[PDB]
From a paper:
Purine nucleoside phosphorylases (PNPs, EC 2.4.2.1) are cytosolic enzymes involved in the purine salvage pathway metabolism in most organisms. The enzyme degrades (2′-deoxy)nucleosides based on 6-oxopurines to the corresponding purine bases and (2-deoxy)ribose-1-phosphate. Purine nucleoside phosphorylase (PNP) is a well-known molecular target with potential therapeutic applications in the treatment of T-cell malignancies and/or bacterial/parasitic infections. The results are supported by a crystallographic study of eight enzyme-inhibitor complexes and by ADMET profiling in vitro and in vivo.
To obtain information on the binding pose and interacting residues, crystal structures of recombinant hPNP in complex with inhibitors 18c, 45b, 45q, 45i, and 45n were determined and refined to high resolution. Bulky, fluorinated-phenyl substituent at position C4 of 45i interacts with helix by forming a halogen bond with the carbonyl group of the Val260 main chain as well as van der Waals and other interactions with other residues in the helix such as Leu261 and Gly264. The addition of bulky substituents at phenyl positions C4 and C5 in 45i and 45n both lead to a 2-fold decrease in affinity toward hPNP, compared to 18c. Compounds 45i and 45n, however, have quite distinct poses within the active site: major differences between the position of the central phenyl moiety as well as substituents are observed. While both bulky substituents extend toward the helix, their poses are quite different, and each makes different interactions with helix residues. The structural explanation for comparable affinities of 45i and 45n is the flexibility of the phenyl-moiety binding pocket that enables to accommodate moiety shifts and by the substantial shift of helix to adjust to the position of the bulky substituents at position C4. Crystals of hPNP/45i were prepared in a hanging drop using EasyXtal 15-Well Tool plates, with a 500 μL reservoir, which contained 1 M lithium sulfate, 100 mM tri-sodium citrate, and pH 5.4. Cubic crystals, dimensions 150 × 150 × 150 μm, appeared after 3 weeks and were harvested after 4 weeks.
Numbering used by the authors:
A (entry chain A): 3 to 287
B (entry chain C): 4 to 285
C (entry chain B): 4 to 286
Write the structure that this text describes.
Amino acid sequence: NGYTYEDYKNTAEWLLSHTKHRPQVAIICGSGLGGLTDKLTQAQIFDYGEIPNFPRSTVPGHAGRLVFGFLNGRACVMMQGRFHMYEGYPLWKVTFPVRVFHLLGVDTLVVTNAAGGLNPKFEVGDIMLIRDHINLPGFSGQNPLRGPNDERFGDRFPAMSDAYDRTMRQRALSTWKQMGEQRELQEGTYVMVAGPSFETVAECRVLQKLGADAVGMSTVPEVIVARHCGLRVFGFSLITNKVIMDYESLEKANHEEVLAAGKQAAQKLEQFVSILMASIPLPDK
Amino acid sequence: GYTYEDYKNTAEWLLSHTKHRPQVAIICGSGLGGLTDKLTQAQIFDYGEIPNFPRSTVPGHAGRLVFGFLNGRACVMMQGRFHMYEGYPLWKVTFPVRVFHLLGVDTLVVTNAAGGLNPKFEVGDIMLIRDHINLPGFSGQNPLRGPNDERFGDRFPAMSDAYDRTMRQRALSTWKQMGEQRELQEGTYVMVAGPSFETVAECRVLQKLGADAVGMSTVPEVIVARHCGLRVFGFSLITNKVIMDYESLEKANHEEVLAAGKQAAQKLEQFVSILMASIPLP
Amino acid sequence: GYTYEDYKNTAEWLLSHTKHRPQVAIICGSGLGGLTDKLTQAQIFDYGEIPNFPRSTVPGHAGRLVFGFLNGRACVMMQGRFHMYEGYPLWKVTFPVRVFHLLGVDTLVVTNAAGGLNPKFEVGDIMLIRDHINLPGFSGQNPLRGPNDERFGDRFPAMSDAYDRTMRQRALSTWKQMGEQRELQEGTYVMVAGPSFETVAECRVLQKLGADAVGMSTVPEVIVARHCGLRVFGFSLITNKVIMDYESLEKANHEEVLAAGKQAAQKLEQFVSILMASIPLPD
Ligand SMILES: O=c1[nH]cnc2c(Sc3ccc(Oc4c(F)c(F)c(F)c(F)c4F)cc3/C=C/P(=O)(O)O)c[nH]c12
Ligand SMILES: O=c1[nH]cnc2c(Sc3ccc(Oc4c(F)c(F)c(F)c(F)c4F)cc3/C=C/P(=O)(O)O)c[nH]c12
Ligand SMILES: O=c1[nH]cnc2c(Sc3ccc(Oc4c(F)c(F)c(F)c(F)c4F)cc3/C=C/P(=O)(O)O)c[nH]c12
Ligand code: NA
Ligand code: NA
C-alpha cells in the first residue's frame, strides 16, 4: 500500500480537533529517552491505535504513544518509541508521523538514537551531534520518498546536503557548556544500516573507510522526510558500545551491554533535552 | 513479473502496427527529449496504447515510443523513461529493452543527467560511460532477479564488457570530426536509487568507490540489454558538481538539471544524430 | 511469514519420519552436491514432501534434504540451497536453518562457489571463510528482519565471532597433515545479490572494501545459524578470478565456473568428510 495526501490530512485534522496543544517541536525519542514524556506538563496522550491511519506498534511493550504537552514551557509532540526497518516496517510507515507533524504546524524535529562508535575517540556514554549521514539503505532503493511525490509536501528531488541545522547544533553545545559537564559533546557522521545483527569486523572496517563516526538502525528516513517537508532537524546519538574493529579483541557488541548503556545515560539525556528546549528558536515572525 | 508471451505479444503488436524495423533503440535522458524532432517518417505510440507497456500514474508526464530515421538510421526512441524512484519495479523499468530485442534492435543508446564527482568535470560536460557501479544491484535491486529465461540470455551474464569499446572510440573521433573543442569526458557512472540528492558524506563515499558521475537511471536498462546480447553505448550530461564540502551554499536542485538540459539540447541531439553513421550495420 | 509453531511442526514431522538425529547441518554449494553420496544409511526427503518447506521452482533444481552419517557423524545435508537472485525472500532461503536448530543440530557447515578478488588466489583454491561483508544486509536484505523470537535468538545478535575459531585451527591442522599441493586460503567473503557478474569498477570497489572472494549466497544462512547459537564454518571454492582491470580478454562465464566446480570440488568434499571427525561432540 501507501498513503494519500487526504490520509495525512485526516490524521492531522483529527489530532488538531482532539487536542488543544499546538506543537512547534516534534521529539522522536530513541534509546534512553523513553521516559522523557514524564517531564511534560499538561500532557495529553494518544495511543497510535486511537489515531486514524497511524501504524500500530506490533512489537513487545506498551501501545506506541503520541504525547502532547509543554517541555520547559515549549509546545512539544513526543513519539515515545519509533518504528525500525529491522522490525519489518516499510519506510512509508516509519516516516508517516513526520508528515503528520508537518501538517500540525511543527517547524522543528528533534530525533535521537543509540549508535555504535566507529570513531576510536568515542567512549560509551558519549553524545554525538549528527552533523551528516550516509543513507546506505537509500542507495539501494530504501528511501522513504520512493513513489509518487506530492508537491504539497515538497520537491520531487530534495537536497540533503544541509539537513542538520547549524543553529540547533550551536545551541546543543551552549546548553552542554552551561551544564559544565566533564566530557565534550562529540560531532560526526551517522551511517544507517538496516540491522538488526551487529557488524562483523570486516563490516566495521567498511563503515570506517566510508568516513562514518557512528552506526545505527534508524533516524535517516525520518530526517529525509522532515527535510522534504522543510522542517529544521536536530539529531544526536548515544554511543552505547565501541564497534569491534580487529580480530584480536576479546570484546563483542551485545544487547545486554547496550541496554545497560541506555539505562545509565537515560536521566542525563532527559536533563540535556529538557534544558535544550529553552534554547530552541521561536517560530518565524 | 511479465511472462515471455507478454513480451512476444507487445513486440508482435508493434511490428504489425508500424512498418518500421528499428536497428537502434535510443532511451532519451534529460537534455535529449527533443531528439525525436530530428526523426523523419516518424510513427508514434503512446505507452498507454501499447499492450503490457507501463505508463505514468502521474498525469504530469505521459510517454511516447517514436519509430523513425535518425540521419538515415532506423531507430526507436523512448520519450519518457521509467525510474526506480517513481516506484516502478526494475522488471517494469527494463520492460521496453526486452521488447526492443524482440523487435530486432541490436544496439541500445542510453543517455542520462548525472552529478559530477570527478573534480576534472565542469557543468555542461558530456561523459561517455566506460563502466558503472550498480549500488542497488549489490542489495538485490537487479532487473534479472527472478526466474531466468534462456530465450533472452544466461542465468549469470558478464557485465565487465557492457559499454562497447568500438562505439566509444567512434564517439571520441566523431566529437573531434564535428570540430568540438571542449573535450569528451569518459568514466564510471554510479547508480543510486534517489530521489533525494546526496549529502557531503555520501558524495565522499561515491568518490572513494571510484565513481566519476552519479545518477538515478540507466544501469538496469544496460544490464537487461547485455543479457539480451545488445551492443550498448551511453553518456551522461554533467548537470551539476556534487557538493563535496560544508561551506558552499550550492544545493543540487531539479532547476539546475532542467536548465543544463535545455542549454546542452542542440549539441547532444547533433552528436547523437551524427553518431548514427558510426553504428555497425546488422 | 511463519511463527515458532510452524518451525516446530516441520521439525516434529521430520523427527517422526526418520530415526536419524543430526548434530551437523551441511549446506552444499554449487558443484559440491556429490557430498550426499559419501553419507552411510542415507535417507532422502524432497522439499516438496516436507510441511511448510519452501519448494525450489526451477524444472531441474534438486530440492532434497539428506540425513545420514558422514565419516561417522550424524548430519543433515541440503543438496540445493535457495538464492535471493532466483527471487526467494531471505525468510525462505533460511527456514531450513531454523528447522535444523529445532532438530537439535549444533553445527552448520556452509560451502559455496566464489569469484576470487584476492589476486593471490588461483582457480580451484579453497578459502576458509574468516569473515563476511553483508552488502544486502546494509540495505535491509537481512534474514532477521521482522518479529524476533528468543526460542531462536536475541533481537540484536553479534556476528563479529560468526566463523568458529576452533574449526579454523583444525581445518588448518587437517589440511597440513594431508600434504596438499596448494595451501588452504583464508579471507573475507562479500555477498552480492547477483545474478549478473561484476563490472571492473564493481570488482575494484569490493577489493577496496577488503573482500577476498565474492558470491551470491551463504551470509544469510550464517546470520540465522549464529542467531540460533550454532557453531559455523565454511569454505569458498574459487571458480574464477574476477576481472579487476580494463587490459584483459578474459570474461567470467557460467560454463568456466561449472567446469571448475567439477574439478577440485571433490577435493573440498573429501576435506569436509575428514573434518567431520574434528567437530566437537555435543555435551
Ligand atoms: O554497533 C552497532 N551497530 C549497529 N547498530 C547499532 C546500534 S542501534 C541499536 C542497537 C541496540 C538497541 O537496543 C537498545 C535498546 F533496545 C534499548 F532499550 C536501549 F535503551 C538501548 F540503549 C539499546 F541500545 C537499540 C538500538 C537503536 C534503536 P534507536 O535508538 O535507533 O531507535 C547500537 N549499536 C550498534
Ligand atoms: O547530483 C546528482 N545526484 C544524483 N542524481 C543526479 C541526477 S539524475 C536526475 C536528477 C534530477 C532530474 O530532474 C528532472 C527530471 F526528473 C525530469 F523529468 C526533467 F524533465 C528535468 F528537466 C529534470 F531536471 C533528472 C535526473 C535524470 C534523469 P535521467 O536522465 O537519468 O533519465 C542529476 N544530478 C544528480
Ligand atoms: O565472480 C563471481 N562473482 C559473483 N558471484 C560469483 C559466483 S557465485 C556462482 C556463480 C555461478 C554459478 O553457477 C554454477 C552453477 F549453476 C552450477 F550448477 C555449478 F555447478 C557451478 F559450479 C556454478 F558456478 C554458481 C554460483 C554459486 C552458487 P552457490 O555455491 O553459492 O550456491 C562465482 N563466481 C562469482
Ligand atoms: Na569493425
Ligand atoms: Na557500499
